[PDB]
Structures are given as C-alpha cells and as structure tokens.
Amino acid sequence: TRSSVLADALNAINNAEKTGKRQVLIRPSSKVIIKFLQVMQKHGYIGEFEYIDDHRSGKIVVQLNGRLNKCGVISPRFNVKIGDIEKWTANLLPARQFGYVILTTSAGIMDHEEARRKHVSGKILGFVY
Amino acid sequence: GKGKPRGLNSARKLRVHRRNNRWAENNYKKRLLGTAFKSSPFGGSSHAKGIVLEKLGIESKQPNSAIRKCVRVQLIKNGKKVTAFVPNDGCLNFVDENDEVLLAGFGRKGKAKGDIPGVRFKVVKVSGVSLLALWKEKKEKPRS
Amino acid sequence: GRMHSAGKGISSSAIPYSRNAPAWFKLSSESVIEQIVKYARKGLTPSQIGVLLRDAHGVTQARVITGNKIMRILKSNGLAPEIPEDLYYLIKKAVSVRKHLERNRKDKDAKFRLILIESRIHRLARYYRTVAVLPPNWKYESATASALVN
Amino acid sequence: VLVQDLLHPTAASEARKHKLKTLVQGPRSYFLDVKCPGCLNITTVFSHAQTAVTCESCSTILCTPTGGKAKLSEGTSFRRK
RNA sequence: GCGGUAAUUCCAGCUCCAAUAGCGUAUAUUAAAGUUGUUGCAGUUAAAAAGCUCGUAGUUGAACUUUGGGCCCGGUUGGCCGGUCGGAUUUCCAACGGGGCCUUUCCUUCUGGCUAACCUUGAGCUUGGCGAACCAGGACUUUUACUUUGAAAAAAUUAGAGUGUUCAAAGCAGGCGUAUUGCUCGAAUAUAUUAGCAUGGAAUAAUAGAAUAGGACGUUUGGUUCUAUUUUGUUGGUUUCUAGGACCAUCGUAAUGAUUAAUAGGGACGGUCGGGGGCAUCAGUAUUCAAUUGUCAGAGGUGAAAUUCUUGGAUUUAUUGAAGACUAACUACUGCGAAAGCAUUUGCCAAGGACGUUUUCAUUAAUCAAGAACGAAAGUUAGGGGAUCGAAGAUGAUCAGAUACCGUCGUAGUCUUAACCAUAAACUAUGCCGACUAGGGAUCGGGUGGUGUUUUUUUAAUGACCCACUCGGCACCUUACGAGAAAUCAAAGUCUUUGGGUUCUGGGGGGAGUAUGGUCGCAAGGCUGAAACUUAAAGGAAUUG
RNA sequence: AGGAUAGUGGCCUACCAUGGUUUCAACGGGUAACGGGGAAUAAGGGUUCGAUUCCGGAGAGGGAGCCUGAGAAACGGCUACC
Ligand SMILES: [Mg+2]
Ligand SMILES: [Mg+2]
Ligand SMILES: [Mg+2]
Ligand SMILES: [Mg+2]
Ligand SMILES: [Mg+2]
Ligand SMILES: [Mg+2]
Ligand SMILES: [Mg+2]
Ligand SMILES: [Mg+2]
Ligand SMILES: [Mg+2]
Ligand SMILES: [Mg+2]
Ligand SMILES: [Mg+2]
Ligand SMILES: [Mg+2]
Ligand SMILES: [Mg+2]
Ligand SMILES: [Mg+2]
Ligand SMILES: [Mg+2]
Ligand SMILES: [Mg+2]
Ligand SMILES: [Mg+2]
Ligand SMILES: [Mg+2]
Ligand SMILES: [Mg+2]
Ligand SMILES: [Mg+2]
Ligand SMILES: [Mg+2]
Ligand SMILES: [Mg+2]
Ligand SMILES: [Mg+2]
Ligand SMILES: [Mg+2]
Ligand SMILES: [Mg+2]
Ligand SMILES: [Mg+2]
Ligand SMILES: [Mg+2]
Ligand SMILES: [Mg+2]
Ligand SMILES: [Mg+2]
Ligand SMILES: [Mg+2]
Ligand SMILES: [Mg+2]
Ligand SMILES: [Mg+2]
Ligand SMILES: [Mg+2]
Ligand SMILES: [Mg+2]
Ligand SMILES: [Mg+2]
C-alpha cells in the first residue's frame, strides 16, 4: 500500500515534467513534501505551489517551469555521515557544479551544500536536478 | 519494487539470500565443498609426480584424424591412475616405461583440452630432465 | 483493497468541510444526547443511531452537533456494550456460517469464507487487546461464541 | 492540455466529477423539509435515507428507501434545505 | 581452428615482433564479472512468478502538535582604501554561517554563598540590586534510534610532511659555523569500521503521557506516619514546639483534559446484481434396451471394404415403458467465483462483490518464512449405480510389417455417497499492494440528472429504451512520449537521469528433478534434493532463401 | 548452607525448586579454521587471503598427575600408562 507520500509526489512531478505539463496535483501533502518543494523553489526548479486545505491531509498544486529534469527519492532514508555526502553526490548527481542531494538533518531539511556549510549530516531523502 | 527488500532493517534477508544464491555459482561451490582436496586426482596441487605404466595412442576427436601419444601414470601420493599427454614431436621416445614423471595440468581448470578426449594433464619432466630441454637437445637423459 | 477479496471499490461517505454546521438546525446538543440515549436503551448500535438521527431527524453528525462521538456518549452514560460492535457482528456471522456448515457439510465455499471471517475476528481482537478495550486472556472460541453474542 | 488551472476549475466540471475526486470532497446529498397532508409538523428527511421514515404525528409513510435517493410518497410536499 | 602433395598455424632456415636479466608454463585467487547484482542482475517467449487463498518469525506502514515576524551582539568571507614597500588594517555597502532577547513561549529547579553583569552615583571610578558566569550538595528526573564534536582505538604496515640512502626501493636521519671551543631544525599529520564513553542538535522514524480522572498546579486547611540537629545543665529515657520526607482527605486555581476522519481498512444499513456455493425438487428431448405394431430384403459401417445383424423378419415406421447420464439451440472478445471451476425449473440455507450513504470504529493496514483450507482430469479404498462413450483386451481391415491411425465389440473407468491422492501448457507461460503517465468507443453491474421515447389508467409511480455523467469490473481499437533483443506492451512504461513496499524463483547445456537420506501417502506417487562425469556451444526473437 | 580456592561463582557437596537455550538459527556436523594487527586486488562498493618478523592464546610424541617456587600442571623438571 501507500508507504512514502514523498515518493508518489516526486513521481507525479517527474511524469508531469516528462510530459511537458506546467502544473501537477500532489496528494496527500506532507510537511516533508512542503519543505522539499521549498528547497526546490529556493533553487529555482519548480516555481510557486499552493496548499489546498481539505480537512483530511491536504493537496498541493505545483506550478512547473521546464528547469527540472529529475526530482527523485532515496528510499530507505539511509543514515549519512559527512563524507558519505560526497560519496552519494558522486553516485547520484550529474555533475559537481549543479544538482542537490537533499537530506533531513537535526537542523532541518536542506541541501548538501547548506549541510556542508552548517557542518551537520543526517538522513538522505532524495535529489533534484 | 524490484523484488529484493529495501528496508533499513532488512539486511539479514539479503545476507542469507546471497548465501543461497552463491551456492548457485560454480567456483564458490567447488571451493567450499572441497572437491579439489576430496577429488581431482591431485590434492588441489599445481603438479604431481607419478610412475609410468603404459604408453597409449589415443585417437583424436573429430573433425581431426591423429594419434596423440599419451601415457598412463600411477600417482605416488594417491595411487590414482591418470592419463597424461606428452607434448612434442617425438618426445614419447624419452618416457620408455617405469619412469618417474612430473605432471601438470594443461590450463583448462580440470577440463579436457582439445581433440584429446579424457586427458587433463601433461608431462613436464622425465627423471628430472625437462622434456623441453630433451627435445631441444640441451641435456640428455640419465642411464637409469 | 478489501483484504479478503480482490475488490477495489470506493464506496464511502464524503463528509463536509464545515465542522460547525448546518445553520438550519433543530434540536440542541442536550436534546440530541437524550435522543441517542433513548435509542440506545432500546438496543440500537451507534451505526443505527446515527442512521436514524440522520434520516428521521436532521443530524448531519453527532460529532459536530455535539462535541463527542456516539460511542463516547454511550460510554459516559453507561450504555457501552461488552464487546465492540464490528467484532460482535463478525462473531454473529461466523456463528451463522458454522451452524450452516453443520447442517451442510459439503459447503467448502462456506468453509473458506468462515476461515476468512475468523482471520478477521482475530485481527480485530488483536487490535482491541493491544489498545485495552478487550482484556488479555480474551480469546474467541465458537463454542462459547454462540452466546458471546448473548 | 499542458496548461490549466487546477485551483479554479469550472463548476460544470466539478459537478460532473465524482464527489471524492473533486478538489475538495463533499456530499452531493441534502435534506428536505417534508409536509404530510394534515398534520403540518414538518419533518426533516435525508435524501438517501435508508429508512422508511414516517412523521411523529402519524405513521403515514414519508419516504421509501432505494439503492440511492429515497422515493418520497405520492402525497407529500418537500423543500430542499 | 591448422594439417588430406602449392600448410601465412606442424619440423626447420631467414627475417620480423613483444617483454627483457628476465621470460614462459601449471595451480589458486583478484579485477574483468552489472556472469552474486546494497550500490547494481534477471524472471511473458532465452534459466527462473509457488496452482489458489488464508496466515505465524520478519520487512514495510496515511496526515496532524512552534510556524512566522522582529530587535540586538559579535565571528568567516569578501570590498574601495593599499593610508605598508607582490604583504595588511580598520570605519563601509553584501553573502555566509552562531548566540541571546521579545512576540500568549518555564527554555526543570530547592537550600546557600562570589551576589553577578548590581535601583547599586560618592562631586565625573563610589559606602548598599535578582544564586551559577565560580562551586557545593539535593527534589527530581519518558525511553530509544540518528547525526555533529571529542576522547579512545599499541607499534609496525597504509596514505602522507620534511630530508642525500650518489638516484631509487629504503632509512629517520641530518644541517650550519671562524670546523680552533661548537650551534641547531627534527623524528610531523591523517585514516583506523562496528560495540562501548562523553558532548551539541533535535528534523526524520519509533515510544509514553490527563478519559469508569486513584490527573496537574498550591499561597490554603485538618490529619496519619517516618527522620531529626541546635539548645534547654550535663550521659541517657520521656516529651512540646520546631525543621524536613512521604501519604490520605477538602477548599481553592485552572479556555480543566479525547487530533483528523486518509479517492487506507473493518463494520452496519439500503435497493440491487450474479451460469458464486450447498441441499432438496422439476422439466427436456436424445441414447440404449424392452414390449406391442406394420411392411419387407437387405441394413450397417468406409476413401473402398470386411468383421457384425438379417424370412427365427434385421434396418425402418408408429405407440408406450424403464434406466442412467447430460443441460443443446438462446451462448456473446457477456457474467459470478481465491483459483480449480460454475449454464434446465422451483424452494430453502447461509455467503459475497460493486454501488449509494452528511452511518459507525478509528490505523485496526500491505506483503508474507513456518503453518493451514480449497485444489480439473486421471488414479486408489469401499458401497451403490452402471444408459452412453470407452486406457486394457478381442477382432475386421490397411500395411513390407501395424498387437497404430480407420471399423465393430468391449471390461476398468466415466455418475454418485463416504474417504484418499494434491498433481497439470493448474497459462495472462506476466506475483500481491499502491501512485502517476495518451487518446477512442462499446459493453456488464450500481447510482445521479434530463419538461427526453414508449407501455399502462390520454395521464400516473414503475418497468424497458435514448442522451449526458459517474464508481467499479471483463475486455477491445489506435499511437508510441516511453520501454523492449525483438516478437510486442497502457503495462512488459514512470529503470545507468539506475531506490514506492513486499514474498518467491534462476545463474551455460547435459547428467537430473536422476541417486541417496528424510517426510507425507493404502498405493500410484508427491515434497525436499546432490555428486561423479561430460560438453562449446544449447537456447530466444527476427531475416532472406 | 557448607566445603574448596588467592579469591567470585554448581567450582564441588547436601537439601529444595524446575528451570535455561532456540527460525533474531539453539544443539549438532564440517573447516584443506589459532585469532587479530594486517596482505593482494580494488573508480566507488566489495571479493579473497592472513602457518609466517608485532600482540594475544595453545602445545612440547599422546594422555594424565605432581614437586619446587612469587610464579609452572614446566616438559632442554620429575612420576606413571600408551
Ligand atoms: Mg525503512
Ligand atoms: Mg567443433
Ligand atoms: Mg492480505
Ligand atoms: Mg483503491
Ligand atoms: Mg599460431
Ligand atoms: Mg616458423
Ligand atoms: Mg567494478
Ligand atoms: Mg544475467
Ligand atoms: Mg521452451
Ligand atoms: Mg522458460
Ligand atoms: Mg500464476
Ligand atoms: Mg513498524
Ligand atoms: Mg547507542
Ligand atoms: Mg474514510
Ligand atoms: Mg447489504
Ligand atoms: Mg444456485
Ligand atoms: Mg420390423
Ligand atoms: Mg438449456
Ligand atoms: Mg449473464
Ligand atoms: Mg508444478
Ligand atoms: Mg507456472
Ligand atoms: Mg499498477
Ligand atoms: Mg453504467
Ligand atoms: Mg466503464
Ligand atoms: Mg466483469
Ligand atoms: Mg553463472
Ligand atoms: Mg545450470
Ligand atoms: Mg557460596
Ligand atoms: Mg548454590
Ligand atoms: Mg588446524
Ligand atoms: Mg596447517
Ligand atoms: Mg606450556
Ligand atoms: Mg616430532
Ligand atoms: Mg608436561
Ligand atoms: Mg628440546
């Protein structure tokens, strides 16, 4: 059954972007989905999005530019140390210049560059580029 | 989900699954069952000394018409009987009988080599004199 | 889903967004509570009480008319049954099927569906035991089940 | 389509859609103020009632249940509420 | 692969090539090998989805609880300036990271001292605020996982800094002076899993709390019990108050205290739906047989025949009767069921899906080793039944033979009751759950709407149809954005841009689903299941012949 | 509870109870198994090896027992059996 809602969200976004659509509807709108999309937004990969408050769990309507090639999820949320960050980024990013591996740290959810700056590590959620 | 479990607490499954599917291999199976030490007329050794009993004119496999000039060898440590091939033009005439030859494999990890059916070994020495050297006339065979 | 079938149906209520409703409204919370207690003293279950308040009176749902649910109201007014209602109905169904199977020994479809029903009973009993509305040492046995109904 | 507003759809489409599959799910059912001949004493009746509802004044009959919407009796007057 | 009287492959000569004081061979191992697959395999057809469902060790598991805004402080990078002769400051626009405070925000405190930063202000450096910033000891104190930092992890080895072994492998040496007396730099640093130790963070993922309140606060108010120093003048025995725990009680204070209701799941209810199941019952012709009946010489079968039946009347006709099986046509890219499977009527028994629902519970869920139910046909045991067809068998042919195909007979079986067996091309050769991604129309079931058509009693409500829509199914047509070795696929897609969850199986072909041992079974056999040995191809999909 | 031990302890004895481990793999079997530090090969992950210069353990042909001593179940020390 449904286990990771983030995975379904990013699969839907990926398929919309592959099909050329400029918007997509996410159900059922978790907090980690919100913060993930906020990271992608701060780096300029999706655009605006809107949380529809049904009284159950939420929906999200995301606007999409064409800047996104793959937003992905890493399940299980592996525990990641400060050099394993580099190992991962090598494995699952296209280049050393762009792309962001995203990891939930005790200092919030962030990208791996911000995690290197703050000098903290955590659990790996996914990636975007 | 590609079959295999991905969960962060599912490592025991992966381990024991690997163990079984490793037994599905060939090299792992031969290494762990100990077939070399238990079978394989040597003892997993590179070479073995043996005593010649008989010379043989083994006929080649097809498509090939030839006779391959082998010998029967009783190994000293095991007592096992073994067929071995004497590689060169005319070198069977240095292996007369009751010689103490050194055998090696041919190179196929226990299989049979070419058009020669059933032989897995070759003669490297007779009385410690190196068939290659005897054939190139660098040394001569002892009297006895 | 349908754990014991391959059905994939979506037949469910779609309750409204308004948690405070519906502005055309009759009876106060006390009137609705005494109606609930009246219907419960004559032996109806929360589902029947809800249906009756819904269709005969205007009561969208007791949780918004009142602040509490029907089973809570009954538990607070002393009308809580000895086992929960879904489990009661499952035990009832299993009893009927076992009786039928004794009268008809070649109904293997009935044997199969009885095994399903019993599996379901045991799952719910597991849940109710680990949330402590049934005690541990609660165990379902057909023999005593026939009167565990009552 | 490749571009559309999923936050402000058309009411036609939302009424065409299934109740759960709308932007915000909600009931398509409703209640009625029903008058029986004689005893005014109006009764509140749900459209999908599941019961043979009858007025408290007398057991006349108000609505017979069906697989969906209830069938209100012949001599009755109803007001969507 | 070469070699069968013109050998670029053997034995030699010449020349040439590769590595070179080293080069080759054998065995083993590593890479190659994404041919072990966590990263990272494959499973429709190439090896491989268990026959189907349920289910216990496990794995996985919907959303939700402090967010946002402000004010300050001081760090790291930068940046004119270079105010120094390619080095740096400080007042500067910004970015990057920390700490503190206020916004409803106790972000554990009890007894004390430094009282600290101090309303403390003496005339512009002075006599006197609030316990951690310094300690003591205490009342206590939700539990983990995770991650940061640190300590710890012998040396050698490893990576690596410096440096004359004449270079280098190494080693830990050495270098510099007036070398007459001496001076001096070193022998670093990093890695070192997991477990344990301390530490900051506190997202992610679990865990607990106040719900028949034996709940929290507390300046209160009795009380019960326990411990007790300083003093009363002393050692001790009684005490009174007094100080300190703990517990109970009643008064008081509290917005006193229960998250949603997942297009997750269970359950109830409603009208339906179905060749779903069990029991009983009804009907239909047909087949075989028998009886009676009429007529008469061929009838049966075949490609052609013969075996076979026939003047004792065969075949055929009519009228009946008995038996047992089966359920035609209607019957469809239609239906129900976990699958196997299920088709005459009627009644009973219980069950189930889908739909509807402003009903109820509330995460109870998904998949699942072990374990269990069901499981076509054949087969086995025992009874019954026994028409038809018919493994065996007998026969007539055909044939070189034909103990096969064809024909005629025909036991077991085919049916049923009570037990066994548990297999199949048990096939969609495609595991289950879940989300998304293209169009089109039809159809089964349910529901909604429409002044729609028709029938009723012109009329109503129905029912049956039409239009539109919707949920859920069996499927189908077109395309390939995509996938694929292709055949082809709306899943076999969202997979080197490789991770949604989970179970099973395979690792070249044979030997081999064999031998052996266990276990089940009356048996037949099933489940589990090798090795020796052998082999360079077996195999898939397509292409032209 | 006692004895024994340098000392804890079923280490041993008396009395008593019926416990303890196990699909999170007990117990049993095999190892061409001393364990580590480490070695080879490794893009990354890993696979294989590690009798062997250091650390720990064990043994002195196999078993067992013991004197002396701070310390040995010692073997270039005794006692017995094979
Ligand atoms: Mg996990
Ligand atoms: Mg060949
Ligand atoms: Mg299930
Ligand atoms: Mg569903
Ligand atoms: Mg050559
Ligand atoms: Mg030559
Ligand atoms: Mg590699
Ligand atoms: Mg493969
Ligand atoms: Mg095949
Ligand atoms: Mg196959
Ligand atoms: Mg299957
Ligand atoms: Mg869990
Ligand atoms: Mg820990
Ligand atoms: Mg719901
Ligand atoms: Mg019903
Ligand atoms: Mg029936
Ligand atoms: Mg006649
Ligand atoms: Mg019929
Ligand atoms: Mg039908
Ligand atoms: Mg099978
Ligand atoms: Mg199969
Ligand atoms: Mg799917
Ligand atoms: Mg329809
Ligand atoms: Mg449809
Ligand atoms: Mg269907
Ligand atoms: Mg292989
Ligand atoms: Mg194979
Ligand atoms: Mg003791
Ligand atoms: Mg004891
Ligand atoms: Mg050993
Ligand atoms: Mg050894
Ligand atoms: Mg010793
Ligand atoms: Mg010796
Ligand atoms: Mg000794
Ligand atoms: Mg000696």
Coordinates of C-alpha atoms in Angstrom, one line a residue, chain A residues 3-126:
Chain A
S3 CA 4.2 3.9 2.3
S4 CA 6.1 7.1 1.2
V5 CA 3.9 10.0 0.1
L6 CA 7.0 11.9 -0.9
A7 CA 7.8 9.2 -3.4
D8 CA 4.4 9.5 -5.0
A9 CA 4.7 13.3 -5.1
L10 CA 8.0 13.3 -6.8
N11 CA 6.9 10.5 -9.2
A12 CA 4.0 12.7 -10.2
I13 CA 6.2 15.8 -10.7
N14 CA 8.6 13.7 -12.7
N15 CA 5.9 12.4 -15.0
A16 CA 4.3 15.9 -15.5
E17 CA 7.8 17.3 -16.4
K18 CA 8.4 14.4 -18.8
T19 CA 5.0 15.1 -20.4
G20 CA 5.6 18.9 -20.6
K21 CA 2.8 20.0 -18.3
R22 CA 3.3 23.2 -16.4
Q23 CA 1.4 22.1 -13.3
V24 CA 0.7 19.0 -11.2
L25 CA -1.5 18.0 -8.3
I26 CA 0.0 16.2 -5.2
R27 CA -1.9 14.2 -2.7
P28 CA -1.8 14.0 0.4
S29 CA 0.6 16.9 1.2
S30 CA 3.1 16.0 4.0
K31 CA 5.3 18.5 5.8
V32 CA 8.4 17.0 4.3
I33 CA 6.9 17.4 0.9
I34 CA 6.4 21.1 1.7
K35 CA 10.0 21.6 2.8
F36 CA 11.4 19.6 -0.1
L37 CA 9.4 21.7 -2.6
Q38 CA 10.6 24.8 -0.7
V39 CA 14.2 23.8 -1.3
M40 CA 13.5 23.1 -5.0
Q41 CA 11.8 26.5 -5.1
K42 CA 14.6 28.4 -3.4
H43 CA 16.9 26.9 -6.0
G44 CA 14.5 27.6 -8.9
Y45 CA 13.4 24.2 -10.1
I46 CA 9.5 24.3 -9.9
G47 CA 8.0 27.7 -9.1
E48 CA 5.0 28.6 -6.9
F49 CA 2.8 26.0 -5.3
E50 CA -0.4 26.1 -3.3
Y51 CA -1.6 24.0 -0.4
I52 CA -5.3 23.2 -0.6
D53 CA -6.6 22.6 3.0
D54 CA -9.1 19.9 2.9
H55 CA -9.6 18.7 6.5
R56 CA -8.0 15.3 5.8
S57 CA -4.3 15.7 4.9
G58 CA -4.0 18.4 2.2
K59 CA -3.5 18.7 -1.5
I60 CA -0.8 20.6 -3.3
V61 CA -0.9 22.2 -6.8
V62 CA 2.6 22.9 -8.0
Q63 CA 3.5 25.2 -10.9
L64 CA 6.3 23.8 -13.1
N65 CA 8.8 25.6 -15.3
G66 CA 10.9 23.4 -17.6
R67 CA 14.0 23.6 -15.5
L68 CA 13.5 20.2 -13.8
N69 CA 15.0 17.0 -15.3
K70 CA 14.6 14.6 -12.4
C71 CA 13.4 15.0 -8.8
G72 CA 13.9 11.8 -7.0
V73 CA 13.5 10.0 -3.7
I74 CA 16.0 7.8 -2.0
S75 CA 14.1 5.1 0.0
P76 CA 15.2 3.9 2.6
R77 CA 16.3 7.1 4.3
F78 CA 19.8 6.0 4.8
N79 CA 21.9 7.5 7.6
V80 CA 24.5 9.7 6.0
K81 CA 27.8 10.9 7.5
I82 CA 29.9 13.9 6.4
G83 CA 32.0 12.0 3.8
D84 CA 29.2 9.8 2.7
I85 CA 27.6 13.0 1.5
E86 CA 30.4 13.3 -1.1
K87 CA 30.1 9.6 -2.0
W88 CA 26.4 9.9 -2.6
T89 CA 26.6 13.2 -4.6
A90 CA 29.2 11.5 -6.9
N91 CA 26.9 8.5 -7.3
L92 CA 23.6 10.2 -7.9
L93 CA 24.2 13.7 -9.4
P94 CA 25.1 14.5 -13.0
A95 CA 27.9 16.9 -12.3
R96 CA 29.9 18.6 -9.5
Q97 CA 28.6 22.0 -10.4
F98 CA 24.8 21.7 -10.2
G99 CA 22.2 19.4 -8.6
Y100 CA 21.4 19.0 -5.0
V101 CA 21.2 15.9 -2.8
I102 CA 18.6 16.6 -0.1
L103 CA 18.9 15.3 3.5
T104 CA 16.9 15.8 6.7
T105 CA 19.3 16.9 9.4
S106 CA 18.6 17.8 13.0
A107 CA 19.0 21.4 11.7
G108 CA 16.0 21.0 9.4
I109 CA 15.7 19.8 5.8
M110 CA 18.3 21.2 3.5
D111 CA 20.6 20.7 0.5
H112 CA 24.0 19.2 0.9
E113 CA 25.8 22.4 0.3
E114 CA 24.0 24.1 3.2
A115 CA 24.7 21.0 5.2
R116 CA 28.4 21.3 4.5
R117 CA 28.3 25.0 5.5
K118 CA 26.4 24.2 8.8
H119 CA 28.6 21.1 9.3
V120 CA 25.9 18.6 10.0
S121 CA 24.7 15.4 8.4
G122 CA 21.7 13.2 8.8
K123 CA 19.3 11.1 6.7
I124 CA 19.1 11.1 2.9
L125 CA 15.7 12.0 1.4
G126 CA 16.3 12.4 -2.3

